[PDB]
């Protein structure tokens, strides 16, 4: 018989081009091709679809990327008319980040790999490196959790120190103030950010960056393709690190690659026993074709036809797998690409790469800033809390022994009331705690100011109903939340506390 | 006048629902229910799409409730992609089966007459705490919304001072015969009394069968299943033993008129309070087929004043997704006779059960104390 | 046999019948899901062989 393929196309010449490329694969029952040019809008799109269906409905219906960036509002409806009665639906060129569902697409095959192979790539060059601590940080919501949720699933893997994370931020895509999370990005310990915003969110996030000069030959960057555009590059200072995959804007290798697929799925699904053609017919055709599921099962199982992207595999996602990408870098405002990464081979390009800042080495690991915030509580026997003289000194007192009390001056929340709280004159405090920090400060030599906390709470799991999620507030809160560095607060031990933070030793019973 | 449209498919509801303006609640002189309550027989997707069009073209459209019979989630898909296209909101007044949980997007919220399935499963653990067994096992396939179900249910453990042990959580999927040699194992070494699972209903009838293969029955392993992968069509297969357990919409409590007309006085509050405040009137362009038209996707979203509004003096509020806001679902139990049986109701987040102990199937003595 | 055998829960288990009779038997057991990993098995040679 005849399966003729009904195919949409944006361009009448790639229309012209995919009835050459099925007329040529022909050669290898026989294969017709039916094609229909893009609407404007998703209803007379899904108009024309349905007319399509009534005149073949044998087909597995493919899609390409528009001119218009949006690459979303035509394959949408074409899948959803076809998934009314479980037609699968082929896509060439999109951003498969919000593709990739089963659950809202039946059955969709992503010639081009989503931002998930970005971070695994991410990861793979962080491994390389040695790099054990990264800043990571997303904008989009439905993309960036989703890399963001790939990139803790590869962390989640080796059940050296091993790179399972610093700090992960989340932001807005129409911010313009993400210097609020900058300031926090720079006061923690290594200088390696990777982010995945959109056009403008890297644009200003490259503004601000340059305002406050994040690139002091130790600030290692990892930028994906979305973020690699000229609007973009008209902020963007040198020495970052692009990203770009193989057969980007190749239309017709895309069209050639999804005609040759399609032709082993046709040679392969009618070998098998029982074929229920899908009826010729949108309306009144509310049933399923039983050459739905099992056309699916057996163009995943182990269905791999030639084409231009290699030894194409499509894993457990509906996913093109093996994937090429181009390993770029801005030197000096030219995308050179250092190496080539293709499924496992990390390969570079042996070329001399210079990293952001005219450093001309790798720069190394975290900065170990010696200076700490600690936080503690009012306590009378561990630690005391006195008001300052006029000059901001206080009272050198003395014991028995005649010795000095060696007190400190902590900044703290601590001389107002929670009726009316306010910054406050850092007031001057000492105890037995505080000799302690002393000791341990004259043994490993540190740079330390202590304060204390906003409304004392030793700790708290207070959770809620509002949002789902349980957070520590107070002391251990301001510990987690990484403006505090160690408690030295008289705070007892449990197994509650030990989940989050780990203890040490005691000093006490 | 407000514009409002019944759209029935498949079966047939003409009732009284004229009685909407004999009412007299509308204390605004500036809406009007103006409903049409259109019918039709076919259901293909194009047709829909083009009696909706027509329908929003012959008069000012602001709100449609909608019927069926089907059992599809093309029918939220559609709503979905009208609602992100033409950006009209529609009402699934128990929709057939379109009040069902489903995923959308950022388009116009369409409200579905079906709770969460974390509300699902916080009424299931209230009726095991009613039982007192606080044991149970998690068992599911490879289905979509397993991650959030099971990340909800462990989150309801962690929120309590009772000693919830979930003895083992299964991913599973139905792919080949080892796989199913797997399962069974792991099956083997459940040793829980308590299943939760969530699939369809032909997985279920295949699951069913190979844990009464392995030998999983009614004697002392219960089940609970949410109705939203199960359905209540009325024909329990022979798989399914006497022992389930699940919670469903009122269908059977809250009649389709008193829904349907829950819905259009949530529109009809709704679309009052939005242009009483706002005091602008939108103006529907029903083209269909003019894209210069998409400019009027620039006033505040109708989807924000619509989830926060009430109606009939009871709380009919909307979540973010579209769910409901309002309790009295039923807690449905199919007895030995292969019939679904009424005997719990979930109404205002309280457990009514009866009976004072689960009718379970000699050795069940009382005794007396002082 | 296959619902007692699932209430069994019992790392030790003896048997004596046929060797055709002790294939069938282990066959139902590593369906059911019992195998060598923690559940062990004392049948005699007598009917073993």
Known sequence: KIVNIGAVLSTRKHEQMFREAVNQANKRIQLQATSVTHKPNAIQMALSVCEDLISSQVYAILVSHPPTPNDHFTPTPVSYTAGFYRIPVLGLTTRMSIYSDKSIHLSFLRTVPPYSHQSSVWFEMMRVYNWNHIILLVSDDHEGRAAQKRLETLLEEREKRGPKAEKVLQFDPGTKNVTALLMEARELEARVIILSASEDDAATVYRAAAMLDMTGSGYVWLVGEREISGNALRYAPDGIIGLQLINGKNESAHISDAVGVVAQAVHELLEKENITDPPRGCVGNTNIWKTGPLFKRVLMSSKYADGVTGRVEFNEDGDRKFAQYSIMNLQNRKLVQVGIYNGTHVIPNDRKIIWPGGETEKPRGYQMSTRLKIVTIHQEPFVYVKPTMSDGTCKEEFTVNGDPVKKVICTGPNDTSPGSPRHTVPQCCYGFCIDLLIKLARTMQFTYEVHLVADGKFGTQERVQNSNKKEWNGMMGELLSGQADMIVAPLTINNERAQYIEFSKPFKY | ?370
């Open chain 2, 1 to 370: 006048s407000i514009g409002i449209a019944v759209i029935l498919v498949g079966t047939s509801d003409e009732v009284a629902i004229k009685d909407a303006h004999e009412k007299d609640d509308f204390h605004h002189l500036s809406v009007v229910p103006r409903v049409e309550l259109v019918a039709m027989n076919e259901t293909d997707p194009k047709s829909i799409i083009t009696r909706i069009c027509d329908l929003m073209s012959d008069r000012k459209i602001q709100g449609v409730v909608f019927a069926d019979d089907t059992d599809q989630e093309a029918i939220a898909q559609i709503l979905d992609f009208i609602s992100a296209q033409t950006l009209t909101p529609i009402l699934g007044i128990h929709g057939g089966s379109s009040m069902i949980m489903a995923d959308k997007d950022e388009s116009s919220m369409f409200f579905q007459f079906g709770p969460s399935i974390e509300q699902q499963a916080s009424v299931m653990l209230n009726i095991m705490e009613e039982y007192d067994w606080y044991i149970f096992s998690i068992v599911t396939t490879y289905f979509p919304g397993y991650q959030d179900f099971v990340n909800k249910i462990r989150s309801t453990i962690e929120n309590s001072f009772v000693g919830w042990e979930l003895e083992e959580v299964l991913l599973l999927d139905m792919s080949l015969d080892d796989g199913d040699s797997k399962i069974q194992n792991q099956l083997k070494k459940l040793q829980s009394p308590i299943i939760l699972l969530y699939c369809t209903k032909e997985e279920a009838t295949y699951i069913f069968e190979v844990a009464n293969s392995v030998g999983l029955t009614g004697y002392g392993y219960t089940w609970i299943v949410p109705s939203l992968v199960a359905g209540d069509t009325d024909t329990v297969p022979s798989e399914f033993p006497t022992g389930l357990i699940s919670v469903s919409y009122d269908e059977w409590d809250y009649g389709l008129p008193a829904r349907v007309r829950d819905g259009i006085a949530i529109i009809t509050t709704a679309a009052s309070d939005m242009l009483s405040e706002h005091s602008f009137i939108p103006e529907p362009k029903s083209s269909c087929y003019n894209t210069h038209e998409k400019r009027i996707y620039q006033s505040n979203m109708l989807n924000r004043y619509l989830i926060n509004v009430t109606f009939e003096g009871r709380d009919l509020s909307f979540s973010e997704d579209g769910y409901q806001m309002h309790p009295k679902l039923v807690i449905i139990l199919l007895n030995k006779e292969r019939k679904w049986e009424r005997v719990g109701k979930w109404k205002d987040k309280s457990l009514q059960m009866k009976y004072y102990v689960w009718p379970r199937m000699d050795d069940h003595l009382s005794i007396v104390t002082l």
